[PDB]
Amino acid sequence: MGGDRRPITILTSDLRGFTSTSEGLNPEEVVKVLNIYFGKMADVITHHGGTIDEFMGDGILVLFGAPTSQQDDALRAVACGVEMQLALREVNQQVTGLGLQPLEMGIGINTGEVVVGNIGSEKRTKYGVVGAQVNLTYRIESYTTGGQIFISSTTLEAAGDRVHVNGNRTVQPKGVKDPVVIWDVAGVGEPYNLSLAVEEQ
Amino acid sequence: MGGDRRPITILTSDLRGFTSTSEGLNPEEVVKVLNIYFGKMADVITHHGGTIDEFMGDGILVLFGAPTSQQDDALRAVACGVEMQLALREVNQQVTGLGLQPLEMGIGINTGEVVVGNIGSEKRTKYGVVGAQVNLTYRIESYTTGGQIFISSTTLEAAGDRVHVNGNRTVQPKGVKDPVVIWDVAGVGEPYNLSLA
């Protein structure tokens, strides 16, 4: 980029304890499960116009607002989060019939000012993101258990009331100045109508 | 489509306090500083046969043992760490020559079995390393302050006597049940003869 500081919405996912239990698997099985997961997530991210910034062991870092931004960056991110979780049921049917146990995934989303641009060397430049707001997203993701999406207050305000919420948690990770409230996502309303649990008729 | 489980030495570095300091810089300055630092670190790493796995907003993952191994990767990893700290003095001449605060860097090194393989998308897939022992090296490094290299004892045992150590510390990082002993590296002996203070 050469360097810009701007509001974006950052999403990060991780596979709640797959690090640990992968130690039991043959190396081809670890790689296969991970490719099935990554391939499937990459489909949902792309459908929602996110930028896969990086694949990090069993984690994914995604940007909405960089290289290009829109008015609904935060909405698209939340909708992407919910559909990522729902796409995991599918990957879990496959992983499960490979004879392996299902994956569980946690997701954190934060919206804020970050530095974006091309970071790296000669033979290896990387489109990168730097700042406190990046780290806070990882930290938010950390409170999550399997199947959950936690989002900060700035992502909820930025996304709007089409984001449906079960409730909040107030946290303060190591070296954070004041507590942050994070929001437990249930689903997104019109025009997405994506839900983690079905509204029972 | 798959890969291999094998013992490798993994090195990770971090620009201590930089995320926080970057929040005061102009964005052209943040990118330039990263690029000066990565440019030179990549030089040092390449000179030592390290494989650069990833670059992060203030960070490097390096591997000694993937996709090519040999038995004293571990000493060469520690030597590389020592040269990285020393090379930071040149990046700082340029960084401070722009009137900008000097970087400090911490580094963690660990030796263990990981899974390595080709991983990610159906399209632009990178070379990846997975396992607890990757995460351990990031834990090890989180205890570092500017100018300091911390190594696991498996790394010190693989590398041997030519790693000179300032002293020991035993930590219990969360998640992992047993405490790891970590070593404060002062320098390395023949043939590198590189020292940190």
Size of interface A-B (CB pairs under 8 A): 136
- A-facing residues of B in 133-152 (CB < 8 A) are 134-135
Residue A166 half-sphere exposure toward CB, CA atoms < 13 A? 13
Residue keyed to tokens 């094998």: B6
Residue keyed to tokens 């790891």: B180
Q: Does A36 touch chain B (CB under 8 A)?
A: no
CB A28 within 8 Å of CB B3: yes
Contacts of A58 in chain B (CB under 8 A): 130
Q: Does B20 touch chain A (CB under 8 A)?
A: yes
Q: Does B153 touch chain A (CB under 8 A)?
A: no
Which of B103, B113, B99, B76 lies closest to B17 in space, CA to CA? Answer: B103
Q: Does B98 touch chain A (CB under 8 A)?
A: no
> Considering CB atoms only, which of A20, A30, A130 is closest to B22?
A130
Q: Is the dihedral of CA B84, B89, B94, B96 positive or negative?
A: positive
Q: Which residue of B has its CA nearest to A117?
A: B31
Q: Name the residue range of residue A134's domain.
A: 1-201
Shortest distance, CA B13 to any CA of chain A (angstroms): 14
Q: Does B103 touch chain A (CB under 8 A)?
A: no
Between CA A172 and CA B186 the distance in angstroms is 36
Q: Does A174 touch chain B (CB under 8 A)?
A: no
**How distant, in Å, are the alpha carbons of A142, B57, B107 from that of B60?**
22, 9, 9
Contacts of B23 in chain A (CB under 8 A): 131-132
Shortest distance, CA B195 to any CA of chain A (angstroms): 26
Between CA A19 and CA B173 the distance in angstroms is 15
Work out the widest C-alpha separation in chain A, in whole angstroms. 58
Give DSSP secondary structure letters for A73-136.
HHHHHHHHHHHHHHHHHHHHHHHHHTT-PPP--EEEEEEEEEEEEEEE-SS-EEEEEESHHHHH
Between CA A51 and CA B193 the distance in angstroms is 45
Which of A47, A164, A144, A61 lies closest to A104 in space, CA to CA? Answer: A144
Q: Is the peptide bond before B27 cis (omega within 30 degrees of 0)?
A: no
> Considering CB atoms only, which of A20, A38, A134 is closest to B121?
A38
Phi and psi dihedrals of A152, rounded to 5? -75, 165
| Element at B139 (helix H, strand E) | helix B132-142
Q: Which residue of A has its CA nearest to B176?
A: A20
Experimental technique used to determine this entry = X-ray
Which of A1, A129, A137, A12 lies closest to B55 in space, CA to CA? Answer: A129
Q: Does B178 touch chain A (CB under 8 A)?
A: no
Contacts of A116 in chain B (CB under 8 A): 27
The encoded tokens of residue A150 equal 């936690």
Q: Resolution of this entry in Å? A: 2.3
Between CA B56 and CA B54 the distance in angstroms is 7
Q: Does A120 touch chain B (CB under 8 A)?
A: yes
Contacts of A27 in chain B (CB under 8 A): 2-5, 115-117
Contacts of A115 in chain B (CB under 8 A): 22, 25, 27, 30-31
C-alpha angle with apex A141: A140 to A146, nearest 5 degrees?
135
> Considering CB atoms only, which of B22, B34, B130 is closest to A22?
B130
CA A7 to chain centre: 17
Between CA B195 and CA B197 the distance in angstroms is 6
Q: Which residue of A has its CA nearest to B122?
A: A39
CATH of the domain at B145: 3.30.70.1230
Q: Does A24 touch chain B (CB under 8 A)?
A: no
Overall number of domains in chain A: 1
